[PDB]
Design a protein around this ligand. Structure first.
Ligand SMILES: O=[N+]([O-])c1ccc(O)c(O)c1
Ligand SMILES: [Ca+2]
Ligand SMILES: [Cl-]
Ligand SMILES: [Cl-]
Ligand SMILES: [Cl-]
Ligand SMILES: [Fe+2]
Ligand SMILES: [Fe+2]
Ligand SMILES: [Fe+2]
Ligand SMILES: [Fe+2]
Lengths: 355, 354, 358, 359
């Protein structure tokens, strides 16, 4: 168990940006700018800084050329400059490795703290950031598939309860989770900004980054991303969806970038900002929990995820999950799922839904 | 081959309605009225007559209680009363069994001809029908999943070229098809009304009815049907989709009624009314041909379809396809498909996609 | 206008308009950069444009000239022989015709242009150069994509006279607007099984009221408005967006650099059955044009494009003598209602929603 | 100027519900339930309690039968029980009348404080509320026009800077405003929950309630409300819209209930939760500021609004605005608006846009 520090937690506003290491900056640019339409805040020969349509902070995504594709930092903005001090004291008490840079790690961010957190993830906390033109009314630029906000991160970690307690102490509130009747937790979702999630934990071998998620305005915008990928004859990079989630209630899609970093497109979850927001727990065998329409979850969604780096830029060692596997208990040879609890009709034994 | 009659073909306007035999009328009512929101044109203890939001003819669907669920008739509206006579002469010349009822087979249809067509399907041709309130501006009745038009039928038949030529002789024009390099035809789509299809042929054991399709206004209306089915905890009756079709370019969904009759929801195909409308042929191994996004086609979509009846109400015997199977050549053990022709990356062998 | 003995040509649909424009570059910016139409051909004299789902060569030809005007509204006919039928039909009507075996504009073959009995330059053709049908080119699809040509709309002074002539030509009336004293203000009529291929608006004419393009969805029309706001050209949004009464379509009217009016349109209904029910609206029904009762801007009733004769000269305007829709609905002596017979929700001497004429 | 109390401000979460007095409860029920599709939490012969599709607190709207239609309370939820005490101390320090009911003023609310605020508005602060079934996945109930959340209130008040400062001290941050070049503020928008607004100030004679706003998921849901009102032949109850706002960037519609209470339908504004969120100031003469497409703002939008009650249930006296009128300076006889700053072309002098004048 990760202890609760005496030191006060920093006041975290929201997920703000991810730094992803990519192997071929031009191929990555083509995906994120030409295919997906993200907006360039800054670029050079080593990095591309990208933002969503409604963003005013400098960026939501930094693509950094490197030898090994991986998550380098998942950054959360805090409420005040003093909250970066609070973050530093909090993680030091946790016994975590930290590094503070008054002029930032990436362009457009000022005083920033990176940490190797108790789950092995590279978290950044910052307040100071360079404001840019907020493009929210630039309908002359708006794409039929426009990505309008950064919504969340999702982390693969082997022990979900352990991670959950730590994030709650940090001020994240759990909104939804997946458990079974034998005391196992498979996943949890947790927030600061008053949507379903700013980050989320998926049970599995980790630390690995499961995905970064961007929002659209409407469901047809997600449909258009699929249609465009069909026209570009890259439909093989559509991993899963489009669908309606059970957990979160959002319309969604998962696609794969050139380094197999997974990107979710997401819209129309609900408000969670009240402190007694009702927590929703799904059973792992409920075939409407991940896709509300019962569409099967492809095995790659459970097994594949991105490496993460430590503060020296080296890949974190992966620790094996020993708790039961969501893949195995739902779609593996001895798995089970149901449509209606207690009804044999519409249940699946040893296979995925829909044939 | 089915020879072309010397008798002139009836002038067919469009698909108009289907009569489905159902085993439990109340359960079927629940599905078509309460889940799907179709509008009641007439009902009693034996039948429910239903129409879409924009329809002015009496109905687009008749649910008839009976012992064995099946298609009883797929009905096309013809241009004039005289076209019913032309239909009778045409099918008589083909040597088909016909039945003419001057006052109709179902309520709200007048003079009507039913035939056991050369592919074993029960076709009806009629002109006269009772007009009803056209609900196209009744937004006080509009559902979040509103079904707005009847769009098409899809028939399973063993020899697609044979059926295609017969339908061409009847004035249907092929818009799209699926073939391979060996010259096998797996499916064809063909129209009268100036959309992609009024009926369609799927290669397989037949005669069987693959589906009846209704359209929505927008893609979100199809999404809502899925969402509603999840809320009703009947997501197991979502068979395939939602998706974008390759063939037709329509946004689509397939669902299953209480007797396993398959219903497609469909929107936003394209205009085909010019007589030189370009015909599109897809390769059977193209994994974007059926679902443009490359999502796999579940085997039940290829293998399962509804029985059809003869004019006595008995189930039509089935003839097994001898041409190659689309299922087998794409997703079966010796099948394959591609994302990009000639590229092993994104190809699938002995396996479906994704 | 008498019904010829000669058979009418079999008309499939509206197919394209040729508009004369004064500044080709400014017109290009509007139709290509703002509206996203697709270039089939262009040079210093003309720009040929098509919608997303079209396979014929073009739906719009922009021709540089001194005086902005409609030069031709073109209908495609079913067979080559129907061009001969059109020629014989209009000759019997006593109309001026011109036949060009190799077309008037690029990508059209054998074509007949006529100065029709209402003074409009109609073209009939079958032969056209097929192009890449872009209907699945989602790599090109814009948030405001125009997917088809839907219809034309013509200003003419005597609507019944025009209606009868178009009925003889094979168009079928779907909807109209009349009053209780027997005046007709507008009529809509079709060949292709939608609400309209052309339409008549009562007023001084011949003038071209608009050309209409379709979108897939209502949000595509909303995006056009949003984009025009972002470009700071919201003053070129004339009217809308709205829901029509007549046609039931979602709509918008915008103005090109020469004030040619373009409608964007979606989700009208099927009309292909021969006994398709006609719908007649009362002129005082404030839901007939905008279903939500939003006021119809006066320019919509007064402004429209000049049309040319076959020499390229502007057609003389003939004044409407029947009552004016503007005057009887939104002028100082006008009225409209929300519910027939109800004073609540009625408007007298002004438009709906609190406005009078500017 | 309203002074900043020494006492700490309550921590306000969000707007939570309004109580509207209505004259004919059945007619009001038909509007809010049958026309608009709000979900009944409770009703009797005197009150109807309604919530939106995604709500889990007891209600977002209470309709209370009474002799004079008016706003009775605009209610904000606070973060903790202790924040109700803080609200009481805060308003007392401001010299405002307060009333505390341990078991609530309306059903499904617990310990609650109502106040006559410094602008004459009846505010409620509460934490405790009865949870109900959250209908957010009840797609079997979902309407083509479904109202999914309560979004905001909008208040008419004569002195916008005076109100703005008071609300800022209370912790609301201004996200957008409308000013001119002569020092006049015509309107301001301010939030707690991280959308553009939880409440808003519109310059005018007040206190009056301008509107209550509900959100939809998508723009087509707003269009459906319009379409349905046409089918019901109540298009005369569509006041303004649908449109795209400049301020807020939301797609919108304004409609009028049976007592002329104005309801906004709203979707797809942007995130404001960062504390340095950029404040956007529009010039009052910019004809894209209220409707981005330049559609004219109907004069009733500027002149009509609902009465508000004091804690005794009597109507609050109206105080006249002396600052310049947005109506007058934009669409009135000496008004002006532009499409492009400094361009005569597309400007409007002494009339509205798109060919209209004031009736
Ligand atoms: O591509 N296919 O799977 C198709 C295309 C159109 C259809 O109507 C259909 O039922 C199947
Ligand atoms: Ca000034
Ligand atoms: Cl999921
Ligand atoms: Cl109109
Ligand atoms: Cl506004
Ligand atoms: Fe996610
Ligand atoms: Fe189909
Ligand atoms: Fe039109
Ligand atoms: Fe508002």
């Amino acid at each position: 168990e990760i202890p609760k520090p005496v030191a006060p937690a920093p006041d975290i506003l929201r997920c703000a940006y991810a730094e992803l290491v990519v192997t071929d900056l031009a191929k990555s640019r083509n995906f994120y700018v030409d295919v997906l339409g993200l907006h360039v805040s800054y670029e050079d020969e080593n990095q591309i800084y990208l933002r969503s349509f409604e963003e005013f902070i400098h960026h939501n995504l930094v693509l950094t050329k490197g030898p090994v594709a991986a998550l380098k930092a998942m950054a959360f903005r805090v409420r005040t400059p003093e909250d970066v001090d609070k973050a530093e004291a909090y993680y030091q008490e946790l016994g975590c490795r930290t590094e503070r840079r008054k002029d930032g790690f990436v362009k457009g961010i000022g005083d920033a703290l990176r940490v190797e957190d108790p789950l092995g993830f590279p978290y950044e906390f910052f307040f100071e950031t360079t404001h840019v033109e907020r493009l929210h009314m630039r309908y002359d630029l708006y794409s039929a598939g426009e990505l309008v906000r950064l919504d969340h991160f999702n982390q693969v970690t082997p022990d979900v309860p352990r991670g959950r307690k730590y994030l709650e102490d940090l001020g994240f509130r759990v909104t939804e989770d997946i458990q079974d009747d034998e005391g196992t937790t498979y996943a949890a979702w947790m927030h600061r900004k008053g949507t379903v999630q700013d980050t989320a934990l998926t049970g599995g071998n980790g630390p690995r980054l499961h995905h970064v998620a961007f929002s659209t305005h409407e469901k047809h915008n997600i449909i258009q991303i699929c249609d465009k990928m069909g026209a570009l004859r890259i439909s093989d990079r559509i991993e899963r969806g489009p669908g309606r989630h059970g957990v979160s209630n959002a319309f969604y899609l998962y696609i794969l970038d050139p380094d197999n970093h997974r990107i979710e497109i997401y819209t129309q979850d609900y408000y969670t900002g009240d402190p007694d927001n009702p927590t929703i727990t799904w059973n792992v065998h409920d075939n409407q929990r991940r896709d509300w329409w019962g569409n099967p979850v492809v095995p790659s969604w459970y097994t594949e995820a991105s490496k993460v780096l430590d503060l020296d830029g080296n890949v974190q060692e992966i620790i094996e999950r020993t708790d039961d596997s969501e893949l195995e208990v739902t779609i593996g040879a001895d798995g089970f799922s149901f449509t209606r609890a207690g009804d044999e009709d519409g249940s699946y034994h040893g296979q995925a839904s829909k044939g």
